[PDB]
Design a protein around this motif. Structure first.
Motif, PDB file in Angstrom:
ATOM      1  N   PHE A   1      54.571   7.959  49.327  1.00 33.58           N
ATOM      2  CA  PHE A   1      55.478   7.665  50.424  1.00 33.58           C
ATOM      3  C   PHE A   1      55.594   6.161  50.630  1.00 33.58           C
ATOM      4  CE2 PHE A   1      56.207   7.580  55.185  1.00 33.58           C
ATOM      5  CZ  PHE A   1      57.573   7.728  55.032  1.00 33.58           C
ATOM      6  N   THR A   2      56.837   5.681  50.669  1.00 31.01           N
ATOM      7  CA  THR A   2      57.173   4.265  50.764  1.00 31.01           C
ATOM      8  C   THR A   2      56.533   3.553  51.958  1.00 31.01           C
ATOM      9  OG1 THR A   2      59.115   2.781  50.654  1.00 31.01           O
ATOM     10  CG2 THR A   2      59.265   4.730  52.091  1.00 31.01           C
ATOM     11  N   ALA A   3      55.953   4.279  52.918  1.00 32.50           N
ATOM     12  CA  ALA A   3      55.306   3.657  54.067  1.00 32.50           C
ATOM     13  C   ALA A   3      53.789   3.797  54.053  1.00 32.50           C
ATOM     14  CB  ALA A   3      55.863   4.234  55.366  1.00 32.50           C
ATOM     15  N   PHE A   4      53.213   4.262  52.951  1.00 38.18           N
ATOM     16  CA  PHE A   4      51.766   4.371  52.835  1.00 38.18           C
ATOM     17  C   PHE A   4      51.116   2.998  52.882  1.00 38.18           C
ATOM     18  CE2 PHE A   4      51.551   8.719  50.552  1.00 38.18           C
ATOM     19  CZ  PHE A   4      51.287   9.332  51.764  1.00 38.18           C
ATOM     20  N   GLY A   5      50.034   2.885  53.652  1.00 40.71           N
ATOM     21  CA  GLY A   5      49.177   1.729  53.579  1.00 40.71           C
ATOM     22  C   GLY A   5      48.467   1.678  52.240  1.00 40.71           C
TER      23      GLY A   5
ATOM     24  N   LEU B   1      58.794   4.421  45.593  1.00 42.78           N
ATOM     25  CA  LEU B   1      60.188   4.050  45.403  1.00 42.78           C
ATOM     26  C   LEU B   1      61.068   4.559  46.532  1.00 42.78           C
ATOM     27  CD1 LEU B   1      60.832   4.473  41.571  1.00 42.78           C
ATOM     28  CD2 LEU B   1      60.588   2.433  43.020  1.00 42.78           C
ATOM     29  N   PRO B   2      62.108   3.818  46.879  1.00 43.67           N
ATOM     30  CA  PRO B   2      63.108   4.354  47.803  1.00 43.67           C
ATOM     31  C   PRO B   2      64.017   5.348  47.112  1.00 43.67           C
ATOM     32  CG  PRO B   2      63.778   2.194  47.081  1.00 43.67           C
ATOM     33  CD  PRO B   2      62.388   2.415  46.528  1.00 43.67           C
ATOM     34  N   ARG B   3      65.077   5.760  47.788  1.00 44.14           N
ATOM     35  CA  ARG B   3      65.914   6.850  47.304  1.00 44.14           C
ATOM     36  C   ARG B   3      67.074   6.233  46.541  1.00 44.14           C
ATOM     37  NH1 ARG B   3      64.489   7.728  52.329  1.00 44.14           N
ATOM     38  NH2 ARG B   3      66.515   7.045  53.182  1.00 44.14           N
ATOM     39  N   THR B   4      66.859   6.036  45.249  1.00 41.97           N
ATOM     40  CA  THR B   4      67.797   5.379  44.355  1.00 41.97           C
ATOM     41  C   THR B   4      67.789   6.109  43.021  1.00 41.97           C
ATOM     42  OG1 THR B   4      66.171   3.807  43.462  1.00 41.97           O
ATOM     43  CG2 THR B   4      67.346   3.152  45.458  1.00 41.97           C
ATOM     44  N   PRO B   5      68.873   6.005  42.247  1.00 42.05           N
ATOM     45  CA  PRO B   5      68.908   6.662  40.931  1.00 42.05           C
ATOM     46  C   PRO B   5      67.704   6.352  40.065  1.00 42.05           C
ATOM     47  CG  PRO B   5      71.078   5.886  41.517  1.00 42.05           C
ATOM     48  CD  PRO B   5      70.157   5.363  42.577  1.00 42.05           C
ATOM     49  N   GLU B   6      67.160   5.142  40.153  1.00 44.13           N
ATOM     50  CA  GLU B   6      65.959   4.828  39.401  1.00 44.13           C
ATOM     51  C   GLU B   6      64.762   5.669  39.833  1.00 44.13           C
ATOM     52  OE1 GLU B   6      67.164   0.613  40.463  1.00 44.13           O
ATOM     53  OE2 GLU B   6      66.333   0.357  38.436  1.00 44.13           O
ATOM     54  N   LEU B   7      64.727   6.158  41.077  1.00 50.70           N
ATOM     55  CA  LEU B   7      63.677   7.111  41.435  1.00 50.70           C
ATOM     56  C   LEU B   7      63.805   8.372  40.597  1.00 50.70           C
ATOM     57  CD1 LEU B   7      61.380   8.429  42.983  1.00 50.70           C
ATOM     58  CD2 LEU B   7      62.966   8.979  44.831  1.00 50.70           C
ATOM     59  N   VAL B   8      65.019   8.906  40.508  1.00 46.18           N
ATOM     60  CA  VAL B   8      65.255  10.120  39.737  1.00 46.18           C
ATOM     61  C   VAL B   8      64.972   9.876  38.259  1.00 46.18           C
ATOM     62  CG1 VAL B   8      66.999  11.789  39.111  1.00 46.18           C
ATOM     63  CG2 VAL B   8      66.833  10.957  41.447  1.00 46.18           C
TER      64      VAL B   8
ATOM     65  N   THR C   1      57.198   0.827  41.172  1.00 43.91           N
ATOM     66  CA  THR C   1      57.626   0.363  42.475  1.00 43.91           C
ATOM     67  C   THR C   1      58.625  -0.769  42.283  1.00 43.91           C
ATOM     68  OG1 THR C   1      56.787  -0.106  44.700  1.00 43.91           O
ATOM     69  CG2 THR C   1      55.988  -1.473  42.881  1.00 43.91           C
ATOM     70  N   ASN C   2      59.197  -1.216  43.385  1.00 45.34           N
ATOM     71  CA  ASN C   2      60.080  -2.365  43.401  1.00 45.34           C
ATOM     72  C   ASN C   2      59.363  -3.550  44.041  1.00 45.34           C
ATOM     73  OD1 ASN C   2      60.013  -1.569  46.063  1.00 45.34           O
ATOM     74  ND2 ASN C   2      62.102  -0.764  46.058  1.00 45.34           N
ATOM     75  N   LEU C   3      60.029  -4.700  44.015  1.00 48.88           N
ATOM     76  CA  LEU C   3      59.378  -5.917  44.464  1.00 48.88           C
ATOM     77  C   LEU C   3      58.940  -5.813  45.920  1.00 48.88           C
ATOM     78  CD1 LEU C   3      58.556  -8.643  43.355  1.00 48.88           C
ATOM     79  CD2 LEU C   3      60.738  -9.555  44.160  1.00 48.88           C
ATOM     80  N   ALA C   4      59.681  -5.054  46.733  1.00 50.44           N
ATOM     81  CA  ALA C   4      59.397  -4.985  48.162  1.00 50.44           C
ATOM     82  C   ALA C   4      58.053  -4.332  48.433  1.00 50.44           C
ATOM     83  CB  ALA C   4      60.506  -4.222  48.883  1.00 50.44           C
ATOM     84  N   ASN C   5      57.740  -3.263  47.717  1.00 50.64           N
ATOM     85  CA  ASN C   5      56.490  -2.555  47.927  1.00 50.64           C
ATOM     86  C   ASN C   5      55.373  -3.059  47.030  1.00 50.64           C
ATOM     87  OD1 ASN C   5      57.029  -0.209  49.935  1.00 50.64           O
ATOM     88  ND2 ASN C   5      58.812  -0.210  48.565  1.00 50.64           N
TER      89      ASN C   5
ATOM     90  N   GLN D   1      43.314   6.376  48.020  1.00 49.58           N
ATOM     91  CA  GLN D   1      42.830   7.749  48.104  1.00 49.58           C
ATOM     92  C   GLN D   1      43.612   8.650  47.165  1.00 49.58           C
ATOM     93  N   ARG D   2      44.921   8.459  47.101  1.00 53.21           N
ATOM     94  CA  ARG D   2      45.736   9.358  46.303  1.00 53.21           C
ATOM     95  C   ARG D   2      45.654   9.036  44.816  1.00 53.21           C
ATOM     96  NH1 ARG D   2      47.291   9.756  51.027  1.00 53.21           N
ATOM     97  NH2 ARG D   2      48.411  11.525  51.982  1.00 53.21           N
ATOM     98  N   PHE D   3      45.430   7.768  44.453  1.00 53.08           N
ATOM     99  CA  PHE D   3      45.148   7.456  43.057  1.00 53.08           C
ATOM    100  C   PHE D   3      43.822   8.070  42.627  1.00 53.08           C
ATOM    101  CE2 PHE D   3      47.840   3.332  42.722  1.00 53.08           C
ATOM    102  CZ  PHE D   3      48.955   4.097  42.469  1.00 53.08           C
ATOM    103  N   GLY D   4      42.816   8.010  43.500  1.00 56.86           N
ATOM    104  CA  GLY D   4      41.552   8.650  43.190  1.00 56.86           C
ATOM    105  C   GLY D   4      41.716  10.127  42.907  1.00 56.86           C
TER     106      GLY D   4
END
Ligand SMILES: [Cl-]
Length: 542
Positions: free
Chosen positions: A113-117, A89-96, A135-139, A123-126
């Motif tokens: 991190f919003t720029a993770f491939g 998520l980006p830095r928005t109230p919905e993140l909090v 997430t939002n539609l963009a990611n 790897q991090r879910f594992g």
């Protein structure tokens, strides 16, 4: 202002637990500690600036209602206490909202991190076994390639296609009840799941008791006051943002600022002016961009900042001086790690000496040591590895990586792997390894040998030699020399010094680049901080 000596003699873990609303043995919940316990006055907790630079202010009351809505949403989606909810998520109230909500039902928040491939997500879910990701539609497309991607909650704008199997986050949450009883947890129980960066990715489980350390850093080191306007620049995808941009200030009940817009220098100066920022925190990468804007750009904002807090990289001394002259604010060096939080600081909230080249002192609640090669405790100015004494550090919360082993924990110590050395007054000075060489075209070159060669010349009063990266040559030998009075720093002189090293030393060791300087970065005792000269040459290539 409290004396630091006193704060060390007067430390007691029980006094720190007193600052919590709950208790790590009886019952604790992070959403209570960062939200519910400060409702009742309808005072602002979140100042958020959207991508179109609109301001939204949200009270602790507002956050509570969002927290409860999300907690219901997650519960109905299958999330039980001790599961992991991930945020992309980006830095928005919905993140909090997502974080406090996850915490509200005793879940574990995992930042992504919003720029993770996609690979780096999988790897991090594992590592975490996250049962849900927000997430939002963009990611949303990035999450399509993840082999082990749990259910997704998508934040949608007005009238957009929701993916096949996803939860309509905004619809579920708006339709969710505002009543959600916060689940009680033990101190040993987790609320954050972090991961290491760029060394091999390991999970760092953050137990709820860490709140004590987190709140200590905000009070002792950032020196956050109730009347401060606090902005931490960093993204909550990484520990410094999640610990101290979101969790830390709310933990104390102080408002925090989130700027959705990409970082630029002019943009930062706008926020600082528009919201009255007095306490700024961020990384050296961010602050050098401010320096690159020029003293003029910083004129309109000079005098506003009370304190600046910098973490992630020891600051170049010139960066400190620029802040004092060009912004009229003291910038302080705070050192920590994803594994620990912050442990060694120049503190804005305790009175102690702030000397050039020092990292400062162990935060109260931590006892640090410099370890021998054998793990014995060395003495002042004897170089060694910075280590946390596990016993005798009541605020320590890291007990090892999540699944993998933790070789940095042995003998009752956690080793940072950073090379430092203590000053007789107790300061920590980052020193850099003395077993270190420059390899230039396959030849291994000792900087000390090169320095000794230079100093024997009458034009050279002080010298420091480091390796600048070069693809053709791996490294190239570069010297920084402080000229004796009477010798002008000309290219003729530079060539003369290079030939002089050729003859005194070897044909391979001579410096290919020579800068003449007025000063070298040093620790309080005099040792040259060559690593700061090296990193400036690396930043110049970027
Ligand atoms: Cl506005």
């Amino acid at each position: 202002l409290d004396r630091y000596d006193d704060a060390v003699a007067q430390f007691d873990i029980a006094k720190a637990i007193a600052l919590l609303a709950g208790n790590p043995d009886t019952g604790i919940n992070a959403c209570i500690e960062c939200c519910d316990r400060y409702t009742g006055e309808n005072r602002v907790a979140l100042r958020a600036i959207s991508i179109d630079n609109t301001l939204t202010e949200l009270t602790f009351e507002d956050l509570r209602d969002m927290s409860a809505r999300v907690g219901n949403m997650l519960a109905d989606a299958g999330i039980s206490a001790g599961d992991v909810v991930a945020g992309l998520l980006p830095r928005t109230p919905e993140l909090v909202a997502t974080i406090l909500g996850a915490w509200r039902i005793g879940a574990i928040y995992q930042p992504l991190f919003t720029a993770f491939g996609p690979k780096a997500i999988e790897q991090r879910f594992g590592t975490s076994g996250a049962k849900l990701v927000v997430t939002n539609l963009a990611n949303r497309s990035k999450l399509a390639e993840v082999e082990n991607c749990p259910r997704v909650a998508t934040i949608l704008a007005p009238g957009e296609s929701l993916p096949e199997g996803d939860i309509d986050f905004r619809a579920a949450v708006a339709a969710a009840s505002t009543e959600c009883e916060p689940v009680m947890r033990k101190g040993s129980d987790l609320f954050m799941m972090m991961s290491t960066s760029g060394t091999a990715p390991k999970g760092v489980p953050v137990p709820l008791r860490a709140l004590m350390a987190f709140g200590a850093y905000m009070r002792d080191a950032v020196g956050l006051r109730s009347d401060d306007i606090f902005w931490n620049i960093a993204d909550p995808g990484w520990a410094y943002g999640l610990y101290y941009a979101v969790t830390g200030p709310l933990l104390l009940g102080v408002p925090t600022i989130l700027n959705e817009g990409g970082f630029t220098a002019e943009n930062t100066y706008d926020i600082i002016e528009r919201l009255g920022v007095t306490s700024l925190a961020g990384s050296p990468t961010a602050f050098r961009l401010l320096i690159a804007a020029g003293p003029e750009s910083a004129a309109r904002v000079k005098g506003r900042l009370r304190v600046v807090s910098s973490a992630g990289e020891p600051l170049n001394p010139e960066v400190i001086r620029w802040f004092d002259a060009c912004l009229g604010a003291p910038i302080h060096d705070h050192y920590g790690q994803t594994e620990l939080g912050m442990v060694v600081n120049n503190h804005h909230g305790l009175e102690h000496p702030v000397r050039q080249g020092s990292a400062g002192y162990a935060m109260p609640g931590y006892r640090v040591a410099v370890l021998d090669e054998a793990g014995k405790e060395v003495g002042p100015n004897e170089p060694g590895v910075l280590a946390i004494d596990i016993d005798n550090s009541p605020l320590l919360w890291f007990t090892g990586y999540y699944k993998k082993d933790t070789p940095s924990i042995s003998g009752g110590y956690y080793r940072t792997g950073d090379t430092v050395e203590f000053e007789p007054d107790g300061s920590i000075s980052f020193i850099g390894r003395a077993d270190d060489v420059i390899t230039s075209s396959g030849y291994r070159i000792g900087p000390f040998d090169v320095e000794s060669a230079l100093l024997k010349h009458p034009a050279v009063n002080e010298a420091a030699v480091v390796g600048v990266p070069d693809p053709q040559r791996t490294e190239i030998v570069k010297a920084f020399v402080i000229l004796a009075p009477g010798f002008e720093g000309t290219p003729e002189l530079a060539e003369e010094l290079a030939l002089h090293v050729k003859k005194q030393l070897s044909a391979h060791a001579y410096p290919r680049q020579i800068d003449f300087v007025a000063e070298l970065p040093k620790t309080p005792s005099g040792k040259i901080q060559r690593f700061l000269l090296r990193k400036a040459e690396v930043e110049k290539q970027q």
